[PDB]
Coordinates of C-alpha atoms and ligand atoms in Angstrom, one line a residue:
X20 CA -14.7 -13.0 14.8
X21 CA -11.1 -13.2 13.5
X22 CA -7.9 -11.8 14.9
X23 CA -5.7 -10.0 12.4
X24 CA -2.3 -11.2 13.6
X25 CA -0.9 -13.3 16.4
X26 CA 2.7 -12.8 17.7
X27 CA 5.2 -15.3 18.9
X28 CA 7.0 -12.1 20.0
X29 CA 10.2 -12.9 18.1
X30 CA 11.7 -9.7 16.8
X31 CA 10.8 -8.3 13.3
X32 CA 14.4 -8.3 12.3
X33 CA 15.9 -6.2 9.5
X34 CA 16.8 -7.4 6.0
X35 CA 20.5 -6.7 5.4
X36 CA 21.7 -3.3 6.5
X37 CA 19.9 -0.1 7.5
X38 CA 22.1 2.7 6.2
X39 CA 22.9 5.5 8.5
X40 CA 22.9 9.2 7.7
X41 CA 26.3 10.6 7.0
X42 CA 27.9 13.7 8.7
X43 CA 27.8 15.4 5.3
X44 CA 24.9 14.9 3.0
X45 CA 26.8 16.8 0.2
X46 CA 24.1 16.6 -2.6
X47 CA 21.3 18.0 -0.5
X48 CA 22.9 20.3 2.2
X49 CA 22.6 23.1 -0.3
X50 CA 18.8 22.2 -0.5
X51 CA 17.6 22.1 3.1
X52 CA 19.4 22.6 6.4
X53 CA 17.7 20.5 9.0
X54 CA 18.9 17.1 8.1
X55 CA 18.0 16.0 11.5
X56 CA 14.3 16.3 10.7
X57 CA 14.7 13.8 7.8
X58 CA 14.5 10.3 9.2
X59 CA 14.0 6.7 7.9
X60 CA 11.7 4.0 9.4
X61 CA 13.5 1.0 10.7
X62 CA 13.0 -2.5 12.0
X63 CA 13.5 -1.0 15.5
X64 CA 10.1 0.7 15.3
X65 CA 8.6 -2.6 14.0
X66 CA 7.4 -3.7 17.4
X67 CA 5.4 -0.5 17.8
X68 CA 3.8 -0.9 14.3
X69 CA 2.9 -4.5 15.2
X70 CA 1.0 -3.3 18.3
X71 CA -1.1 -0.7 16.3
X72 CA -2.1 -3.2 13.5
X73 CA -3.3 -6.1 15.7
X74 CA -7.0 -6.2 16.5
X75 CA -10.0 -8.6 16.6
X76 CA -12.2 -7.7 13.6
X77 CA -15.9 -8.1 13.2
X78 CA -17.5 -7.7 9.9
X79 CA -21.2 -7.0 9.3
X80 CA -22.4 -7.5 5.7
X81 CA -25.8 -6.3 4.5
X82 CA -27.9 -6.2 1.3
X83 CA -26.2 -3.1 -0.1
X84 CA -22.9 -4.9 0.0
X85 CA -24.5 -8.1 -1.4
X86 CA -26.1 -6.1 -4.2
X87 CA -22.9 -4.3 -5.1
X88 CA -20.8 -7.5 -5.1
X89 CA -23.1 -9.1 -7.6
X90 CA -23.0 -6.2 -10.0
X91 CA -19.2 -6.4 -9.8
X92 CA -19.0 -10.2 -10.3
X93 CA -21.2 -9.6 -13.3
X94 CA -18.7 -7.0 -14.5
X95 CA -15.9 -9.5 -13.9
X96 CA -17.9 -12.1 -15.8
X97 CA -17.3 -10.2 -19.0
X98 CA -13.5 -10.8 -18.5
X99 CA -11.3 -13.3 -20.3
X100 CA -7.9 -13.9 -18.7
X101 CA -5.1 -16.2 -19.7
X102 CA -2.4 -18.0 -17.8
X103 CA 1.1 -16.5 -18.1
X104 CA 3.7 -19.0 -19.2
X105 CA 6.2 -19.9 -16.5
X106 CA 8.8 -18.0 -18.5
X107 CA 6.7 -14.8 -19.1
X108 CA 6.0 -14.9 -15.4
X109 CA 9.7 -15.3 -14.7
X110 CA 10.9 -12.4 -16.8
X111 CA 8.5 -10.1 -14.9
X112 CA 10.7 -10.4 -11.8
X113 CA 12.2 -7.1 -11.0
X114 CA 16.0 -7.2 -11.5
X115 CA 16.9 -6.7 -7.8
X116 CA 13.9 -8.6 -6.3
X117 CA 14.6 -10.5 -3.1
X118 CA 16.3 -13.9 -3.7
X119 CA 15.0 -17.4 -3.0
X120 CA 15.8 -19.7 -0.1
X121 CA 16.8 -22.3 -2.7
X122 CA 19.9 -20.3 -3.8
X123 CA 18.9 -18.3 -6.8
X124 CA 17.7 -14.8 -7.6
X125 CA 16.3 -12.3 -9.9
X126 CA 19.4 -12.5 -12.0
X127 CA 18.8 -16.2 -12.8
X128 CA 15.0 -15.9 -13.0
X129 CA 15.0 -13.2 -15.7
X130 CA 17.7 -15.1 -17.6
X131 CA 15.6 -18.3 -17.5
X132 CA 18.4 -20.2 -15.8
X133 CA 17.5 -23.9 -15.7
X134 CA 18.0 -24.2 -11.9
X135 CA 15.2 -21.8 -11.2
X136 CA 12.9 -22.8 -14.1
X137 CA 13.0 -26.3 -12.4
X138 CA 12.3 -25.3 -8.8
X139 CA 9.5 -23.0 -10.1
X140 CA 8.0 -25.8 -12.1
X141 CA 8.0 -27.9 -8.9
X142 CA 6.4 -25.0 -7.0
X143 CA 3.6 -24.7 -9.5
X144 CA 2.9 -28.4 -9.6
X145 CA 2.6 -28.5 -5.8
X146 CA 0.4 -25.4 -6.1
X147 CA -2.0 -27.3 -8.3
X148 CA -1.9 -30.6 -6.4
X149 CA -2.0 -29.5 -2.8
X150 CA -4.7 -26.9 -2.3
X151 CA -4.4 -26.5 1.5
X152 CA -1.0 -26.4 3.2
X153 CA 0.0 -22.8 4.2
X154 CA 2.8 -21.1 2.3
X155 CA 5.4 -19.6 4.7
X156 CA 5.8 -15.8 4.3
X157 CA 8.5 -13.4 5.4
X158 CA 7.7 -10.3 7.4
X159 CA 10.1 -7.4 7.5
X160 CA 9.9 -3.8 8.4
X161 CA 9.7 -1.4 5.5
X162 CA 12.2 1.4 5.3
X163 CA 11.1 4.7 4.0
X164 CA 12.0 8.3 4.6
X165 CA 9.9 11.0 6.2
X166 CA 10.2 14.4 7.8
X167 CA 9.5 14.4 11.5
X168 CA 6.1 15.6 12.7
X169 CA 6.2 16.6 16.4
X170 CA 2.4 17.0 16.2
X171 CA 2.2 13.3 15.3
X172 CA 4.4 12.1 18.1
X173 CA 7.8 12.4 16.4
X174 CA 8.7 9.4 14.1
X175 CA 6.3 7.1 12.5
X176 CA 7.0 3.3 13.0
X177 CA 7.8 1.2 10.0
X178 CA 5.0 -0.2 7.8
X179 CA 4.9 -4.1 7.8
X180 CA 5.7 -5.9 4.6
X181 CA 4.8 -9.7 4.2
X182 CA 5.7 -11.6 1.1
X183 CA 6.3 -15.3 0.1
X184 CA 9.4 -16.9 -1.4
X185 CA 10.7 -15.8 -4.8
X186 CA 9.6 -19.0 -6.5
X187 CA 6.0 -18.4 -5.3
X188 CA 5.9 -14.8 -6.5
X189 CA 6.5 -16.0 -10.1
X190 CA 3.6 -18.4 -10.0
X191 CA 1.3 -15.6 -8.7
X192 CA 2.2 -13.9 -12.0
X193 CA 1.4 -17.1 -13.9
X194 CA -2.0 -17.5 -12.3
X195 CA -2.9 -13.9 -11.6
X196 CA -0.8 -11.4 -13.5
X197 CA -3.2 -11.2 -16.5
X198 CA -6.1 -10.6 -14.2
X199 CA -4.3 -7.7 -12.4
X200 CA -4.0 -6.2 -15.8
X201 CA -7.7 -6.3 -16.7
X202 CA -10.0 -6.8 -13.8
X203 CA -9.9 -3.4 -12.0
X204 CA -10.7 -1.7 -15.2
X205 CA -13.5 -4.2 -16.0
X206 CA -15.1 -3.8 -12.6
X207 CA -14.8 -0.1 -11.9
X208 CA -14.3 1.6 -15.3
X209 CA -13.4 5.3 -15.0
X210 CA -13.7 4.9 -11.2
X211 CA -10.3 3.2 -11.3
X212 CA -7.6 5.6 -10.4
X213 CA -4.3 4.1 -11.4
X214 CA -4.9 4.8 -15.1
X215 CA -4.6 8.5 -14.9
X216 CA -1.7 10.8 -15.4
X217 CA -1.9 13.7 -12.8
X218 CA -3.4 16.0 -15.4
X219 CA -5.8 13.3 -16.5
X220 CA -6.8 12.7 -12.9
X221 CA -7.4 16.4 -12.6
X222 CA -9.6 16.4 -15.7
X223 CA -11.7 13.7 -14.1
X224 CA -12.3 15.4 -10.8
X225 CA -13.1 18.6 -12.8
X226 CA -15.4 16.8 -15.2
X227 CA -17.2 15.2 -12.2
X228 CA -17.5 18.4 -10.1
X229 CA -19.0 20.2 -13.1
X230 CA -21.7 17.6 -13.8
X231 CA -23.3 18.0 -10.4
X232 CA -25.8 20.8 -10.1
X233 CA -24.6 21.3 -6.6
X234 CA -21.5 19.1 -5.9
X235 CA -20.1 18.0 -2.6
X236 CA -17.0 15.9 -2.3
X237 CA -15.1 14.0 0.5
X238 CA -12.2 11.8 0.9
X239 CA -11.7 8.5 2.8
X240 CA -8.6 6.5 3.6
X241 CA -9.0 3.4 5.8
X242 CA -6.9 3.1 8.9
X243 CA -4.3 0.3 8.5
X244 CA -6.2 -1.1 5.5
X245 CA -3.9 -4.2 5.1
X246 CA -5.0 -5.4 8.6
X247 CA -8.7 -4.7 8.1
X248 CA -9.1 -7.0 5.2
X249 CA -10.8 -10.0 6.7
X250 CA -10.4 -13.6 5.6
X251 CA -13.9 -13.3 4.2
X252 CA -12.9 -10.3 2.1
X253 CA -10.0 -12.2 0.6
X254 CA -12.2 -15.2 -0.3
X255 CA -14.9 -12.9 -1.6
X256 CA -12.3 -11.5 -3.9
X257 CA -11.2 -15.0 -5.1
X258 CA -14.8 -15.4 -6.2
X259 CA -14.5 -12.1 -8.0
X260 CA -11.5 -13.4 -9.9
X261 CA -13.3 -16.7 -10.5
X262 CA -16.1 -14.8 -12.1
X263 CA -13.9 -14.3 -15.1
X264 CA -13.5 -16.6 -18.2
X265 CA -10.4 -18.6 -17.1
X266 CA -8.6 -21.8 -18.0
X267 CA -9.1 -24.6 -15.6
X268 CA -5.5 -24.9 -14.6
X269 CA -5.5 -21.3 -13.5
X270 CA -8.6 -21.6 -11.3
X271 CA -7.0 -24.5 -9.4
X272 CA -3.9 -22.4 -8.8
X273 CA -5.7 -19.2 -7.9
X274 CA -7.9 -21.2 -5.4
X275 CA -4.8 -22.9 -4.0
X276 CA -3.1 -19.5 -3.6
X277 CA -6.1 -18.0 -1.8
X278 CA -6.3 -21.0 0.6
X279 CA -2.6 -21.4 1.1
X280 CA -1.3 -17.8 1.0
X281 CA -3.8 -15.0 0.6
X282 CA -6.3 -15.8 3.4
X283 CA -3.3 -16.0 5.8
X284 CA -0.2 -17.9 6.7
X285 CA 2.6 -18.0 9.3
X286 CA 5.1 -15.2 9.2
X287 CA 8.8 -15.6 9.6
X288 CA 11.3 -12.9 10.4
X289 CA 14.5 -12.5 8.4
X290 CA 16.4 -14.8 10.8
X291 CA 14.0 -17.6 10.1
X292 CA 12.2 -17.7 13.5
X293 CA 8.5 -18.0 13.4
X294 CA 7.3 -14.4 14.0
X295 CA 3.6 -14.9 14.2
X296 CA 0.6 -15.7 12.1
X297 CA -1.4 -13.5 9.8
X298 CA -5.1 -13.6 9.1
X299 CA -5.3 -10.5 6.9
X300 CA -4.0 -9.1 3.6
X301 CA -0.3 -9.5 3.3
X302 CA 1.0 -6.4 1.7
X303 CA 3.5 -8.0 -0.7
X304 CA 1.5 -10.4 -2.9
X305 CA 0.6 -9.7 -6.5
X306 CA -3.0 -9.0 -5.6
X307 CA -2.0 -6.4 -2.9
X308 CA -3.1 -3.5 -5.1
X309 CA -5.8 -5.1 -7.2
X310 CA -7.2 -6.6 -4.0
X311 CA -7.2 -3.5 -1.9
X312 CA -8.6 -1.4 -4.7
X313 CA -11.4 -3.8 -5.5
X314 CA -12.3 -4.7 -2.0
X315 CA -12.2 -0.9 -1.3
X316 CA -14.5 -0.2 -4.2
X317 CA -17.3 -2.5 -3.1
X318 CA -17.1 -1.6 0.6
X319 CA -17.1 2.1 -0.2
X320 CA -19.7 1.8 -3.0
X321 CA -22.0 -0.2 -0.8
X322 CA -21.5 2.2 2.1
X323 CA -22.4 4.8 -0.5
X324 CA -25.8 3.2 -1.0
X325 CA -26.0 2.9 2.8
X326 CA -25.6 6.7 3.3
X327 CA -27.8 7.8 0.5
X328 CA -25.0 9.5 -1.3
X329 CA -26.7 10.9 -4.3
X330 CA -25.4 10.6 -7.9
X331 CA -22.0 9.6 -6.6
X332 CA -18.9 9.7 -8.8
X333 CA -16.0 7.7 -7.3
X334 CA -12.2 7.7 -7.7
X335 CA -10.5 4.7 -6.1
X336 CA -6.7 4.4 -5.6
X337 CA -6.0 1.6 -3.1
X338 CA -7.6 2.4 0.2
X339 CA -7.7 6.2 -0.7
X340 CA -11.1 7.4 -2.0
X341 CA -12.8 10.4 -3.4
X342 CA -16.5 10.8 -3.9
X343 CA -17.9 13.8 -5.7
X344 CA -21.7 13.5 -5.3
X345 CA -24.8 15.5 -5.0
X346 CA -25.3 17.8 -2.0
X347 CA -28.4 17.7 0.2
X348 CA -27.8 20.9 2.0
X349 CA -24.8 21.2 4.4
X350 CA -27.0 19.7 7.1
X351 CA -27.9 16.4 5.6
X352 CA -24.6 15.9 3.8
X353 CA -22.9 15.9 7.2
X354 CA -25.4 13.3 8.4
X355 CA -24.7 11.0 5.5
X356 CA -21.0 10.9 5.9
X357 CA -21.4 9.6 9.4
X358 CA -23.6 6.9 7.9
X359 CA -20.8 6.3 5.4
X360 CA -18.2 6.0 8.1
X361 CA -20.4 3.8 10.2
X362 CA -21.2 1.6 7.2
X363 CA -17.5 1.3 6.4
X364 CA -16.6 0.6 10.0
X365 CA -19.3 -2.1 10.0
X366 CA -17.6 -3.5 6.9
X367 CA -14.2 -3.6 8.7
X368 CA -12.8 -0.6 6.9
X369 CA -12.9 2.0 9.7
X370 CA -11.3 5.4 8.9
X371 CA -8.4 7.1 10.4
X372 CA -9.8 10.5 9.8
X373 CA -13.5 11.1 9.9
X374 CA -14.6 12.2 6.5
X375 CA -16.1 15.6 6.1
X376 CA -18.1 17.1 3.2
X377 CA -16.3 19.8 1.3
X378 CA -17.5 22.3 -1.3
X379 CA -14.2 23.6 -2.6
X380 CA -12.1 21.2 -4.7
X381 CA -8.8 22.5 -3.3
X382 CA -9.9 21.4 0.2
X383 CA -10.4 17.7 -0.8
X384 CA -7.2 15.6 -0.5
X385 CA -6.7 12.0 -1.5
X386 CA -3.7 9.9 -2.6
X387 CA -1.7 12.6 -0.7
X388 CA -2.5 15.1 -3.5
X389 CA -5.1 17.7 -4.1
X390 CA -6.3 19.9 -6.9
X391 CA -5.5 23.6 -7.1
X392 CA -5.6 26.6 -9.3
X393 CA -3.2 29.2 -10.7
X394 CA -3.6 32.0 -13.3
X395 CA -1.3 32.2 -16.3
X396 CA -0.4 35.2 -18.4
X397 CA -3.8 34.9 -20.0
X398 CA -5.5 35.7 -16.7
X399 CA -7.1 32.3 -17.3
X400 CA -7.7 29.7 -14.7
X401 CA -5.4 26.7 -15.0
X402 CA -5.9 23.8 -12.6
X403 CA -3.1 21.3 -11.5
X404 CA -2.3 18.5 -9.1
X405 CA -0.2 19.5 -6.1
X406 CA 0.6 18.1 -2.7
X407 CA 2.3 18.8 0.6
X408 CA 6.0 19.2 -0.3
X409 CA 7.1 18.2 3.2
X410 CA 7.7 14.6 2.4
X411 CA 9.1 15.1 -1.2
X412 CA 11.6 17.5 0.3
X413 CA 12.7 15.1 3.1
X414 CA 13.3 12.4 0.4
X415 CA 15.3 14.9 -1.6
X416 CA 17.6 14.9 1.4
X417 CA 18.1 11.2 1.8
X418 CA 21.8 10.5 1.2
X419 CA 23.6 7.5 2.5
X420 CA 26.5 5.3 1.5
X421 CA 24.0 3.5 -0.7
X422 CA 21.2 5.7 -1.9
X423 CA 21.4 8.9 -4.0
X424 CA 18.3 11.1 -3.9
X425 CA 18.5 12.3 -7.5
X426 CA 16.1 9.7 -8.9
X427 CA 13.6 11.1 -6.4
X428 CA 14.2 14.6 -7.6
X429 CA 13.5 13.4 -11.1
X430 CA 10.3 11.6 -10.0
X431 CA 9.0 14.8 -8.4
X432 CA 10.0 17.1 -11.2
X433 CA 8.1 14.8 -13.6
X434 CA 5.1 14.1 -11.4
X435 CA 4.4 17.5 -9.9
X436 CA 5.9 19.7 -12.6
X437 CA 3.4 22.5 -12.5
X438 CA 3.8 23.0 -8.7
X439 CA 5.4 26.2 -7.4
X440 CA 7.7 24.0 -5.4
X441 CA 8.9 21.8 -8.3
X442 CA 9.2 24.8 -10.6
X443 CA 11.0 27.1 -8.1
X444 CA 12.8 24.7 -5.7
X445 CA 13.3 21.3 -7.2
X446 CA 14.1 22.2 -10.9
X447 CA 16.5 24.8 -9.6
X448 CA 18.4 22.4 -7.4
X449 CA 18.2 19.6 -9.9
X450 CA 20.0 21.4 -12.8
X451 CA 22.2 23.3 -10.4
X452 CA 23.6 20.0 -9.2
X453 CA 23.7 18.3 -12.5
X454 CA 25.6 21.1 -14.2
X455 CA 28.3 21.3 -11.5
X456 CA 28.5 17.5 -11.6
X457 CA 28.7 18.0 -15.4
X458 CA 26.3 15.0 -15.7
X459 CA 23.5 17.1 -17.4
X460 CA 23.1 14.4 -20.0
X461 CA 23.9 11.2 -18.2
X462 CA 20.7 9.1 -18.1
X463 CA 18.5 8.9 -15.0
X464 CA 15.9 6.4 -13.9
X465 CA 12.3 7.5 -13.2
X466 CA 10.3 5.0 -11.2
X467 CA 6.6 4.6 -10.9
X468 CA 4.2 1.8 -10.0
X469 CA 7.3 -0.5 -10.1
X470 CA 8.2 0.3 -13.8
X471 CA 11.4 2.1 -14.4
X472 CA 11.7 4.4 -17.5
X473 CA 15.0 5.8 -18.8
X474 CA 14.9 9.6 -18.7
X475 CA 17.5 12.1 -19.8
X476 CA 17.7 15.4 -17.9
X477 CA 17.7 17.6 -21.0
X478 CA 14.5 16.2 -22.4
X479 CA 12.5 17.4 -19.4
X480 CA 10.9 20.3 -21.4
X481 CA 9.3 18.0 -24.0
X482 CA 8.4 15.3 -21.4
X483 CA 6.6 17.9 -19.3
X484 CA 4.8 19.3 -22.3
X485 CA 3.5 15.9 -23.3
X486 CA 2.3 15.2 -19.8
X487 CA 1.1 18.7 -18.6
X488 CA 1.1 20.9 -21.6
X489 CA 2.8 24.3 -22.2
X490 CA 0.8 25.9 -19.4
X491 CA 3.3 24.3 -17.0
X492 CA 6.0 26.9 -17.9
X493 CA 3.6 29.8 -17.4
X494 CA 1.8 29.5 -14.0
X495 CA 1.4 33.1 -13.0
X496 CA -0.4 33.3 -9.6
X497 CA -0.6 30.4 -7.2
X498 CA -3.4 29.8 -4.7
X499 CA -3.2 31.2 -1.2
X500 CA -3.2 27.7 0.1
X501 CA -0.3 26.5 -2.0
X502 CA 1.7 29.6 -1.3
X503 CA 1.2 29.0 2.4
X504 CA 1.9 25.3 2.5
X505 CA 5.1 25.7 0.3
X506 CA 6.4 28.5 2.5
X507 CA 5.6 26.5 5.6
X508 CA 7.6 23.4 4.5
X509 CA 10.6 25.4 3.4
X510 CA 10.8 26.9 6.9
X511 CA 10.2 23.5 8.5
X512 CA 13.2 22.0 6.7
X513 CA 15.7 24.8 6.9
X514 CA 15.5 25.4 3.2
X515 CA 15.9 29.0 2.0
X516 CA 12.7 30.9 1.1
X517 CA 11.2 31.1 -2.3
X518 CA 12.7 34.6 -2.7
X519 CA 16.2 33.0 -2.4
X520 CA 15.4 30.3 -4.9
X521 CA 14.4 32.9 -7.4
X522 CA 17.9 34.4 -7.2
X523 CA 19.5 30.9 -7.6
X524 CA 17.1 30.0 -10.4
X525 CA 18.2 33.1 -12.3
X526 CA 21.7 31.7 -12.2
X527 CA 20.8 28.2 -13.4
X528 CA 19.0 29.8 -16.3
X529 CA 22.2 31.6 -17.3
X530 CA 24.4 28.6 -17.4
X531 CA 21.7 26.5 -19.1
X532 CA 21.2 29.0 -21.9
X533 CA 24.9 29.6 -22.0
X534 CA 25.5 25.9 -22.8
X535 CA 23.2 26.1 -25.8
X536 CA 21.6 23.2 -27.6
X537 CA 19.3 21.2 -25.4
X538 CA 20.6 22.7 -22.2
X539 CA 19.4 26.1 -23.5
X540 CA 15.8 24.9 -24.0
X541 CA 15.8 23.8 -20.4
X542 CA 16.8 27.3 -19.5
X543 CA 14.2 29.1 -21.5
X544 CA 11.3 26.8 -20.5
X545 CA 11.9 25.3 -17.1
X546 CA 13.0 28.7 -15.7
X547 CA 10.9 31.1 -17.8
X548 CA 9.1 31.9 -14.6
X549 CA 12.4 33.3 -13.2
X550 CA 13.0 36.3 -15.6
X551 CA 11.8 39.9 -15.6
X552 CA 10.8 39.7 -19.3
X553 CA 9.2 36.3 -20.3
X554 CA 10.0 34.7 -23.6
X555 CA 6.8 33.5 -25.4
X556 CA 7.2 29.8 -25.3
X557 CA 5.8 27.7 -28.2
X558 CA 5.2 24.0 -28.5
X559 CA 8.1 21.7 -28.8
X560 CA 8.3 19.4 -31.8
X561 CA 9.6 16.5 -29.6
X562 CA 6.5 16.7 -27.5
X563 CA 4.3 15.3 -30.3
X564 CA 6.7 12.4 -30.6
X565 CA 6.5 11.1 -27.1
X566 CA 4.9 7.9 -25.7
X567 CA 4.1 8.4 -22.0
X568 CA 1.1 6.1 -21.9
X569 CA 2.3 3.3 -19.7
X570 CA 4.0 5.7 -17.3
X571 CA 1.0 6.4 -15.2
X572 CA -0.9 3.2 -15.8
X573 CA -0.3 -0.3 -14.6
Ligands
LIG1 C1 0.7 -1.3 -7.6 C2 1.7 -0.3 -7.1 C3 3.0 -0.8 -7.0 C4 4.1 0.1 -6.6 N1 5.4 -0.5 -6.5 C5 6.5 0.4 -6.1 C6 7.9 -0.2 -6.0 O1 8.1 -1.3 -6.3 N2 9.0 0.6 -5.6 C7 8.7 2.1 -5.2 O2 9.7 2.8 -4.8 N3 7.4 2.6 -5.2 C8 6.3 1.8 -5.7 N4 4.9 2.3 -5.7 C9 4.7 3.7 -5.3 C10 4.8 4.6 -6.6 O3 6.1 4.7 -7.0 C11 4.2 6.0 -6.4 O4 4.9 6.6 -5.4 C12 2.7 5.8 -6.0 O5 1.9 6.4 -7.0 C13 2.3 6.5 -4.7 O6 2.2 7.9 -4.9 P1 2.0 8.8 -3.5 O7 3.2 8.5 -2.5 O8 1.7 10.3 -3.8 O9 0.6 8.1 -2.8 P2 0.6 7.8 -1.2 O10 0.8 9.1 -0.5 O11 1.7 6.9 -0.8 O12 -0.9 7.1 -0.8 C14 -1.0 5.8 -0.7 C15 -1.8 5.3 -2.0 O13 -0.9 5.2 -3.0 C16 -0.5 3.6 -3.0 N5 1.0 3.4 -2.7 C17 1.8 4.3 -2.1 N6 3.0 3.8 -2.0 C18 2.9 2.5 -2.4 C19 3.8 1.5 -2.4 N7 5.3 1.3 -2.1 N8 3.5 0.3 -2.9 C20 2.2 0.1 -3.3 N9 1.3 1.1 -3.3 C21 1.7 2.3 -2.8 C22 -1.3 2.9 -2.3 O14 -2.0 1.9 -3.1 C23 -2.4 3.9 -1.8 O15 -3.5 3.8 -2.6 C24 3.8 1.4 -6.2 C25 2.5 1.9 -6.3 C26 1.5 1.1 -6.7 C27 0.1 1.7 -6.7
LIG2 N1 4.8 1.5 0.8 C1 3.4 1.0 0.7 C2 2.3 1.8 1.2 C3 0.9 1.2 1.1 N2 0.7 -0.1 0.6 C4 -0.6 -0.7 0.6 O1 -1.7 0.3 0.2 C5 -2.4 0.4 1.3 C6 -2.5 1.9 1.6 O2 -2.7 2.1 2.9 P1 -2.1 3.5 3.6 O3 -0.9 4.1 2.8 O4 -3.1 4.6 3.7 O5 -1.5 3.1 5.1 P2 -2.3 2.0 6.0 O6 -3.7 2.5 6.2 O7 -2.3 0.6 5.3 O8 -1.6 1.8 7.3 C7 -1.6 -0.4 2.5 O9 -2.6 -1.0 3.5 C8 -1.0 -1.3 2.0 O10 -1.8 -2.5 1.8 C9 1.8 -0.9 0.2 O11 1.6 -2.0 -0.2 N3 3.2 -0.4 0.3
LIG3 MN1 -4.8 3.7 5.0
LIG4 MN1 -4.0 5.2 1.5

């Protein structure tokens, strides 16, 4: 039926500058050596990304989907949501969020400057009163940093980002913000993924695998998900929102937003030229993650009914998906996943990689992360969440005039603290730099789902214990997979081997303990793995005092 995009063929122009790599990346050139392999996407590769995401889509709904949708709209019916006040909505604007054509910006919006408050009042009135005219959107390349893959044809092209004006975005929060904070949890329950700390996520997969008598899991990511959301998906989700107990002013605005923005609108490049028209999900609206994750839930859950996936347990993070279910022999299980894929493709959510039933939890990957196991001193199996370190390393090497990679180092040390690569590579380089910089106690930002939290480098031991527990400073024997992947990435990036890092880590332990105080606790804990004779670490009193709830939620 419907064509995802159409293109006037104007360029997808960049937004401001696109910083270049420098001839010395002086923070990360003691980390890895092949700074050529570390590249950043760019509006140049936008034309190529355009060509891969455009295609006529044909959706084929059936009674499994119809059944599922109703059980979800009934789950949504249990919801009460409230409008956000124009001012609440305003103060949710991120401090550096892209400014408005009408000369004002995140600065003024969060300050409740009267100029903006007015123009946003006039936006929201026109939202309620006119429920048809399209809302112009801006399309721009997305810039993000990757390592090259010569197997994947070199350098990825830049993901497309489409978003409305800054005044608009605040009204989406007035109409919809409250729903984003409740509906995914009300519809899916524990199937909802973005509520779990890494350890909590691991506990869930473990709980699920254990309660099958013969489990079988697989993962599913949809190829170019933002472009396979059809106009009927986006309206079907508006009727999921409308299932909720809402005030009448909200429903009007919601409906107007769906008709005028969400189901599609003309896209403008940064120079203003009409760039094309969009008939799919704009990645950039408030509902981008709620909408993906819920649309994904039904499609995948209906396709589950359609394949005869037995006793399925689901974990949905955006378009990524894990399904630990009941096995029907290796022979039938294979057959079902084809039915799954076919069903999904019939729903306009075709995969990039054909799913495959797996029977070993380490071999199942989704959300770029997998589970894994290590022994401790106790000879006892401890499970953790790890991932391919090739990209986190690459982003640890992004140094330009304008961006310093250290926040990224924090982010990883926090998120994948138990990993052999964080413990032995990142943590080593982190403190090694901070101490020489003599900024070991200057605060750092840790970013996650758009929230930023203030984090001080010397608190890392108690933070990591509240999130991962003391077992994180005692991982004895890593899996043969992890050992191979970590080795493999260090080679691929010209970083020194893990043997080397053990020598350098010994040193950082010395200076850290020799600074005493908090620095010394970082030594004895974060680098206990490094020493011939391990100190018996005990709980930290600070750990019990920490509130890390909203970190890994939404
Ligand atoms: C609602 C939401 C908002 C986010 N906002 C920001 C932000 O403003 N600035 C920033 O630097 N990072 C943002 N992120 C990414 C976030 O910081 C983490 O990196 C995120 O958990 C992805 O982890 P990952 O790279 O291992 O998953 P991935 O390997 O990237 O797999 C993709 C899955 O994770 C989600 N995801 C990954 N990257 C993003 C992204 N930029 N935006 C939205 N979803 C993403 C997708 O929903 C998808 O389900 C956001 C993530 C979510 C889910
Ligand atoms: N940096 C990012 C990455 C993904 N996303 C969204 O989350 C979805 C995840 O899809 P993905 O990461 O597997 O890549 P695609 O399949 O969309 O090409 C995207 O379609 C986008 O809608 C985003 O909004 N910002
Ligand atoms: Mn995808
Ligand atoms: Mn994905």
